[PDB]
Design a protein around this nucleic acid. Sequence first.
RNA 1: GUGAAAUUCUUGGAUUUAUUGAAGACUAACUACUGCGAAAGCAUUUGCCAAGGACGUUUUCAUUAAUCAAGAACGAAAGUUAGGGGAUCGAAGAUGAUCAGAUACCGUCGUAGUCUUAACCAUAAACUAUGCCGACUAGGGAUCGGGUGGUGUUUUUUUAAUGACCCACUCGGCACCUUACGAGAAAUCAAAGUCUUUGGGUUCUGGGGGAGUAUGGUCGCAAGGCUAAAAAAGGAAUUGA
RNA 2: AUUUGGACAAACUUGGUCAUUUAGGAACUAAUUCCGUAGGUGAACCUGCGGAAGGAUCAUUAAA
Lengths: 283, 127, 130, 240, 181
Amino acid sequence: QHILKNPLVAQGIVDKAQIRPSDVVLEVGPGTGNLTVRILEQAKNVVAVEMDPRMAAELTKRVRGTPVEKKLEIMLGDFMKTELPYFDICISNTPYQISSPLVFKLINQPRPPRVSILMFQREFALRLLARPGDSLYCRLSANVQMWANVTHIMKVGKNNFRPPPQVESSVVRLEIKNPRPQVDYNEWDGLLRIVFVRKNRTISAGFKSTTVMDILEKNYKTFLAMNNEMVDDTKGSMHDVVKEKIDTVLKETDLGDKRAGKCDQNDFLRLLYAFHQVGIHFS
Amino acid sequence: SQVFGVARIYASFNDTFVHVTDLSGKETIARVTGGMKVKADRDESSPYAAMLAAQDVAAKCKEVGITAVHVKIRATGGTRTKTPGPGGQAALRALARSGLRIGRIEDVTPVPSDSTRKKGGRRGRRL
Amino acid sequence: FELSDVKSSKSLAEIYEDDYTALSEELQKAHSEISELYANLVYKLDVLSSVHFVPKPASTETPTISMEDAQPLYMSNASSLAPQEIYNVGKAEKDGEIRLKNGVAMSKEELTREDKNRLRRALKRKRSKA
Amino acid sequence: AVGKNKRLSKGKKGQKKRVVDPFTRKEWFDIKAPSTFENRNVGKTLVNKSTGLKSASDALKGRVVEVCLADLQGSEDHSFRKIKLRVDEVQGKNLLTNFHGMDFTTDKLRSMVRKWQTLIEANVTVKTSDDYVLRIFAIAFTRKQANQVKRHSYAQSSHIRAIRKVISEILTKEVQGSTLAQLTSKLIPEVINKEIENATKDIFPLQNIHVRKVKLLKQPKFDVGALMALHGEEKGKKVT
Amino acid sequence: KFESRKIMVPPHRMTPLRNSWTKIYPPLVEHLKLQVRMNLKTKSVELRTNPKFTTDPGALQKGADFIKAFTLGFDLDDSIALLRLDDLYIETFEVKDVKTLTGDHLSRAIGRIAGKDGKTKFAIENATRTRIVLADSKIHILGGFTHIRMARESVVSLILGSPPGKVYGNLRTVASRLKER
RNA sequence: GUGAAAUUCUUGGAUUUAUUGAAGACUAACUACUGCGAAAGCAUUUGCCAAGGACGUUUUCAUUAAUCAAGAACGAAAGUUAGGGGAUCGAAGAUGAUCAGAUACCGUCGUAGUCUUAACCAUAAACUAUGCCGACUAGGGAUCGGGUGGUGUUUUUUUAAUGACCCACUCGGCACCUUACGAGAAAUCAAAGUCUUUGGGUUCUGGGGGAGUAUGGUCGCAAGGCUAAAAAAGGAAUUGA
RNA sequence: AUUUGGACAAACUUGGUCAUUUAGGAACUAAUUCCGUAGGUGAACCUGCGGAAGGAUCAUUAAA
């Protein structure tokens, strides 16, 4: 593990957290407890989940005897598996390998928190902060810029970390878009997978892959079966007849030629609307 | 006088096949496996498995009535290693101690002249 | 410990026969040599600081006889053993029994409830002392 | 592995009882080499059954056996040598066999492989006067002279191609002049590589000149009378 | 009923074979009773079991393993150790089988897996109680089954590029558990 | 199958055995302190097409030479566009196992790709980390190619080739090793040497690290626009009192 | 196919029946480094490809 060496950046974390006194705050990996006692001093309720029995024991031994131990509660177990309550702010410093599924979880949480602040790698943070026209744009970047809006705060140093890691870090803030736009996440994820198989090929060729053609053929086929219609007989492959269909969609939209690193959410939605319009569904 | 068998012994890295066939390799006399011999998953490449396998297939070979045998080991070959194993040496010792009349030992391992790319990668396959 | 990167003096048969056959003989011989040296040096200092005559300490297989006996040589080992040191009393092996240091033994079922109470009180106070 | 902690799979849901009696239903059949060899009586094979004489015949015709010339001719000098034959005809537990191919042993090839010489290979494709299509692989090494002060013995590619052409000429001429059994008899006492040696004696000192391998590629039409001739009629016993 | 085996020898191995041939046959012809001949015409050695002089099934096989180990490049005493035991087993493998490398990369790798003056090789041999033979690409490891297994894992690490300090760390670790057992 | 299991598929019997056939790649060992190419790069057979090095020449002509902005050609891998097949391997992705330990961190599938055609794309630790052309300055062994001389052996002889090894010499190369008479920060260097401070011809370039600060000097970057909660020994305790 | 009247009548609702299980007080028992390229969602970085050492060389080994 790694321990922080900057109560000043802890002060920066709580200052950018911008605490409301009516907050229940959930913390994954509370650590040695500096952030824990700061949020215990700042908020109304602090729930801390922990997977380390030794860390939870040293924490309860450090916080046993304070006035806010009645407001502090320590839950044990894999927070990704166990049930989580409502919270207004989430602050954590976990290993990022479980933070990215935690990122998806806090996006898809029912009644999502108002604001949240997280710590990531420098590369991971820039990949999340990737805009169109930039080199780090990915499926994760398009997902987070679709479902929410982000804001950079600051960067962290490994020499200021103990022990110093290899990869640098940074601190970001996540705010879920209220209300959430009614995009079927299945359709959005399927189209994002299909468009970001290669971010610099043509979207035409990205559909011209065989497996996406087969998947959308099966999807449109069971769609036609559920709508109870019959397809005209294709002399070659059903993949090829619905490929011609999607090519008509592409030359209708005039965007399938483009580069996937530059097109925006508006072109994304007009394309998915064209696909739901012609009856193509990614799930 | 004697009657000969074909003791094809595949010395896999984590397995041992002791298959004996008749002439032209068509009439398959017996076939056995290391893990089947010793019911473990670490010990499917065990010299002890080779011992028990050689003893059992020697019992079958003397059962059918074949006395002498030419034995042909074969490693993994392919793009993998082409050197047979200590399980192969153990099986050879065990069959020699079983006492079937060894006519000739062979190492027929399929060696590529010029093969394809292995599943390793740019840094190495294992460890 | 630490390994050696020189050539092994012995072969596989030699190390395997060695294994196929005191902390260590080296520490034993080292203790022996430094003991004889300390004996000689204490002897030298006794020479230099003695008013009275002190000779040399001593001089530094086969069946061999030990002249000096630290015992009367005709006493049995069982005779020199003390009865306490050959049997003491402990707690009973059956948990339904309780054996005391004065040798008394009590079954947990032939007792009365007041006696079980005071016995639990005694065990509690002794364990709390512990 | 068949241990109690071997996690069960689909596998042996439904199996059978070992009642096939394979070694009692099977039948031993002695194969026998053509008359060009000393010990024609070598090796017995097992036919699976006897109710299908058709199955016996097609299986024995599909049999492709292999032997070594050492055990074939009693001279264990030719242990490295190895040939493949195939039973072409059957006659009452005795099976006529005929030649199919040839190779050496890998350890012989490996030992002949060295580091300070050049290996030359010739791979000719030919058809006999017996109309057997064949492919021949032969090998030789660039030895050094007795006066050789050089560590290596390497020659020019001009010499390589010239000697290659010389070799392939020799093979084509001898095979087209020969028939099948004639080629086998030539093949036995290594005389062809000696011929190539005496031919290439002027170009360069060579060594380990050996025909590596023989590949039957096509066989002509069937001639049981010719097979009986090259191998070397029967009444019954009055069962009642 | 005699029974015989033949074993080739390369000339670079035949030179110390001729040099120290005198101590080769006394362990076998006396304790295993195995007829020896050596065709320098064929660069091979022949071993024949006589039925009345010898009734021992695995002895010809054991002598075959002995001469195989020596010809593969192992020393006389360790090949004799293989004769004394029966559970001594050899594994050879190649650098191109584990991870193909080219030219000076292969050269630097051989220098790495050798270490300065075979010091690392001696460390491996002392730790795993194994014996190692380092050819151009063929690497031969004689010893017990799990011993040569552990040595194989270590030398695979060396080939892949492990630094010798961390190699020594893992070495004293595995030697600690092997000395504890 | 791994360190270990596990996903996986095996009575329509996998794995294996033998007999093949198809596919698409690849051209090992031989193989070098070898060779070829301006480099990148170049190993199956044979043929063709051209080309080129070097050696040999009492052939040719007679400065036609070097350095060179502009401009031109080539340029690993990957990547991009349009085709092909597409065995293997395989950024992505998908999962089994997440077991202690990573001392022993994968297993499986599989898109792009991997190769090819037609184009781009011009980066590499594209390194001898070392401008070119030219001249001089130690040896000693090598090898390769060419030629010469003689010596031998193998070789062969009105046939279509007389080639192979020896030594002496010769060019021209891959180089190797010793040393300096020289130089230096030293390693070292036959150049990174050519008499103290210095002129053979020629393209280019210049006058450490982190930290901390001021920034008009510059470029990117955004958001939301109704939403609400008010002190405890009133301990612990199979242990106490 | 359809049809008359009875009885059984599942099942449901509305409850009645009895049955069986399922915190307060009150008792007791027991106590490795680098380039370039491509990519990445269980990302203290990793994968893939093509390159460099600026990564530590022991042993045998002319012929009979």
